Design a protein around this ligand. Sequence first.
Ligand SMILES: OC[C@H]1O[C@H](OC[C@H]2O[C@@H](O)[C@@H](O)[C@@H](O[C@H]3O[C@H](CO)[C@@H](O)[C@H](O)[C@@H]3O)[C@@H]2O)[C@@H](O)[C@@H](O)[C@@H]1O
Ligand SMILES: OC[C@H]1O[C@H](OC[C@H]2O[C@@H](O)[C@@H](O)[C@@H](O[C@H]3O[C@H](CO)[C@@H](O)[C@H](O)[C@@H]3O)[C@@H]2O)[C@@H](O)[C@@H](O)[C@@H]1O
Ligand SMILES: OC[C@H]1O[C@H](OC[C@H]2O[C@@H](O)[C@@H](O)[C@@H](O[C@H]3O[C@H](CO)[C@@H](O)[C@H](O)[C@@H]3O)[C@@H]2O)[C@@H](O)[C@@H](O)[C@@H]1O
Lengths: 140, 134, 140, 136, 139, 140, 137
Amino acid sequence: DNYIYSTEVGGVGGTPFTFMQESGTITSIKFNWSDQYKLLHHIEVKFINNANIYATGDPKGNHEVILEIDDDETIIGSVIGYKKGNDGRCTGVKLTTSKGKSIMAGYFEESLITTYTGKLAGIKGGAGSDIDRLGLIFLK
Amino acid sequence: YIYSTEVGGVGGTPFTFMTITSIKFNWSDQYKLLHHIEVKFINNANIYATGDPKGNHEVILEIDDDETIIGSVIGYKKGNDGRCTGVKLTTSKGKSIMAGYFEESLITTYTGKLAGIKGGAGSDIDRLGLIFLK
Amino acid sequence: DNYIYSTEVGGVGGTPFTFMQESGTITSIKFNWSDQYKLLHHIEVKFINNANIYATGDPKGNHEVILEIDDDETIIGSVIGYKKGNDGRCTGVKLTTSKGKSIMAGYFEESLITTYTGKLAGIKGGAGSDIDRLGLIFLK
Amino acid sequence: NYIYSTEVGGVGGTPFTFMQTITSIKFNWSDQYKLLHHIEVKFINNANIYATGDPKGNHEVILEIDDDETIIGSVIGYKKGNDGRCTGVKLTTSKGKSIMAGYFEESLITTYTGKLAGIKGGAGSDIDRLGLIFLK
Amino acid sequence: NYIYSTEVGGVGGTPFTFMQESGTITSIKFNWSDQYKLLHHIEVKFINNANIYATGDPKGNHEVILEIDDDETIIGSVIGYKKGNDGRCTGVKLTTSKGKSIMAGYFEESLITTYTGKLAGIKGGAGSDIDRLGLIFLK
Amino acid sequence: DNYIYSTEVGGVGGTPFTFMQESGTITSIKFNWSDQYKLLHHIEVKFINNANIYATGDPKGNHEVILEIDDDETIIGSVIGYKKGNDGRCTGVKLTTSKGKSIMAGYFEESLITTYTGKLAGIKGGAGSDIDRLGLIFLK
Amino acid sequence: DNYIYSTEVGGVGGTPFTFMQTITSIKFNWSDQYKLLHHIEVKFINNANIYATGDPKGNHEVILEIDDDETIIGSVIGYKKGNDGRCTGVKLTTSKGKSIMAGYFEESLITTYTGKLAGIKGGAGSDIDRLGLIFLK
Ligand SMILES: OC[C@H]1O[C@H](OC[C@H]2O[C@@H](O)[C@@H](O)[C@@H](O[C@H]3O[C@H](CO)[C@@H](O)[C@H](O)[C@@H]3O)[C@@H]2O)[C@@H](O)[C@@H](O)[C@@H]1O
Ligand SMILES: OC[C@H]1O[C@H](OC[C@H]2O[C@@H](O)[C@@H](O)[C@@H](O[C@H]3O[C@H](CO)[C@@H](O)[C@H](O)[C@@H]3O)[C@@H]2O)[C@@H](O)[C@@H](O)[C@@H]1O
Ligand SMILES: OC[C@H]1O[C@H](OC[C@H]2O[C@@H](O)[C@@H](O)[C@@H](O[C@H]3O[C@H](CO)[C@@H](O)[C@H](O)[C@@H]3O)[C@@H]2O)[C@@H](O)[C@@H](O)[C@@H]1O
């Protein structure tokens, strides 16, 4: 591929998902989480030049954040909080862009990945009630 | 034109105001929402208003002809019964404003030259999206 | 005009005033205010190459601040505090210059304008006992 | 060839004018009265100390200014009105030197900046009124 | 063509060397415990190689992963340890040339501030714990 | 003189001292001070190209600091704390160099002098049991 | 010499030592019990010998490895003054934002000369009695 694949972190649960577009970058990402369970429950992605919302997980959470990404905007800093192991869950995400935009979703109470940086082109993982595992995908 | 996600509820009357030289946010401590927004444009003296100026606070941001939004955050209640609660804007000249409350959900929007606003208002600002120039 | 007019903020009361010189900018501005009423009461302005003092409002306040402005010195940051509505008043002013000078007069308890920036050339509003309304005027 | 910052404070005291640039300036103030009482000034190529006011205060600060050194930041605290007094001074220089004398409880002037060339005002027992004077 | 940072901690554990002919680290995982306050397990991935190299026993209740871009160097590196023959490696702080930083474990006894540069591999000794850890850099 | 003399600050007491070497600058300066009396007691000075330690005052203080100065290193900030008057004393010294080296000695509880900056070439004042008075001397 | 010698700070005790050949590694051993340095090890560029002095009796150590092009921009040694003096701590900061901190700073301080750390010199037996840094020009 012409892509970089960040480690999927979290557990083995959920239905798999992959969100990529043939020559497309993420223009919008949404994280839904709960104070009650301290996990991510639901993720939405929009891509450049495509009106479709791609969604996974159950939007059961009392909070959401959206990050909109300009066409020339990169991720210069990215951290995913998670519970490790087979019954693991994805708990939080901090993103920071080349234009000083940042977002913070969920909780960071067990494990952390500091991912590869670049132009966010997609996400892969598994989800059901919760976001079980999550990995970012970048352009090279 | 770049259209930023309209955030908040499906309630109130649609509006579309379409570069911005002045924007005013009216909010209340009682309901912790935006109620009223005014906009003035370059080379036009008409004031475009929406929602009800019920709130006990207002802020005005005046934008220079060559000034851009380098930072923009809208707080809101998600759901069909959603509301805009708050706006934070930061400009290319270190100017910044802060209206309302940021107690539930947040969007960090596209940046650029603020060229208009779309959404729905009645008693309150139900939904708000920014619009930028390319 | 070769002038930018910032929104006049506060109420409709008081006698209109406009302080502007045919080809001059403000070299000195003084704000009078009170802890008792938590409003601006009085403003004085001197201009480059003019020894007249232009005054408006009643100097009844227990506090004053003077900002002296060098000829090549601009405002880069400007905020006016006020009470909105017909019975509105101007409550405070924060100015910051291109040479790191700043001043702070009065109170910021209700409403705010972040104004246009530039070379402060004049002011315009209404005053009697109090500063009813205030708007800044800049060069282009 | 001089810029005159507003003289701030009262109408009281014997007038003074110190001009000849300032190489040294000393402020004397009291915690009892919360005012400046006394100021001394030395100038470049001149060993005379020019004083005004009564050095009754329990604190002093001296700022020595290098020959190429400017004031980039200057604030004088005062009581406004005819019975007015100069209550405090903050100076910051082009070399990151700063000083703080006295109190800032009532009124403030943020003065013009530049090469500090002299001072002017009135003083008897207290510093009644103080204006800075700058080169162009 | 390689710079060897001091191996810190004890003499115990099976030796290990993770390095690939003309290949730098792209991912490194540190597993540690609040119970024993040590590193227990390290995993490493290399550029153009899908094999995971692991050592120690993954019994810790915490992990951190640092992914390294191909042009990304280490500008700050601190390893926490207990000195002596019975020694252990207790913690790792890394900072990269792109403002990425990670923090694993505890810094309660001894500290090395290592050489900097392009992290090429790791060497030391591990069994149920990481006994000893040294970094390996390109020039 | 090809020297600049900073005001000597503190009292008229002790024995006069003047530490200068024709065509040599300070390479080391030691300050000794007391928590008990909150004053400087004793200073030493070494010069470039001279092994003689010049000392003054009584080294009775429980603390000392040494600043070594590289041949090309200037003082870019200098503050001396002191007690004003005939019975005055020198209580404290902060120095900062052109290479970001700083030292801090003693207490700053009464009066302050922010001195001239430049190449520290010598010191002057008076001392017996304590440092009564201290002035810095700079090159041009 | 083509070297700058920092003031040796501490007491007159100990066997004298001088380690010169630039430093690629320096290790400080110190105790919470006595709150002094006890032991220093140095390795040099292109030399496998470990040069050691004092007694490694302390419960803490710190190692600073120094890249070939890396200098000391900040340097503070903590000590007890007088003839029965000791060296109590070291703070070094490098041109690459690296810093280490060993032992205690409860009495006296030297802010030393800076530059490329080329060696050390002092006296030690049970403790580090005195410590001076050596720099290139
Ligand atoms: O004959 C005395 C006169 O006294 C009062 O009116 C005059 C002033 O009253 C003040 O309290 C105030 O209302 C002033 O109003 C001016 O200033 C206010 C505040 O800025 C402004 O809003 C107004 O527009 C005016 O500029 C009045 O001047 C009354 O008691 C009156 O009845 C009486 O005749
Ligand atoms: O009767 C007036 C005044 O009398 C007493 O003060 C008198 C003198 O006091 C001196 O200490 C000094 O204040 C003199 O005034 C000079 O100094 C002040 C301060 O700068 C200045 O305002 C004056 O202009 C003079 O230069 C006074 O004359 C006191 O009883 C006082 O309370 C009383 O009002
Ligand atoms: O027996 C001699 C002397 O003993 C006592 O004074 C000793 C010292 O006491 C110090 O506190 C101080 O007073 C000293 O004064 C000298 O040093 C100070 C500090 O620098 C200085 O200001 C003075 O100018 C002196 O040089 C004393 O030396 C007393 O019992 C005394 O009465 C007796 O002479």
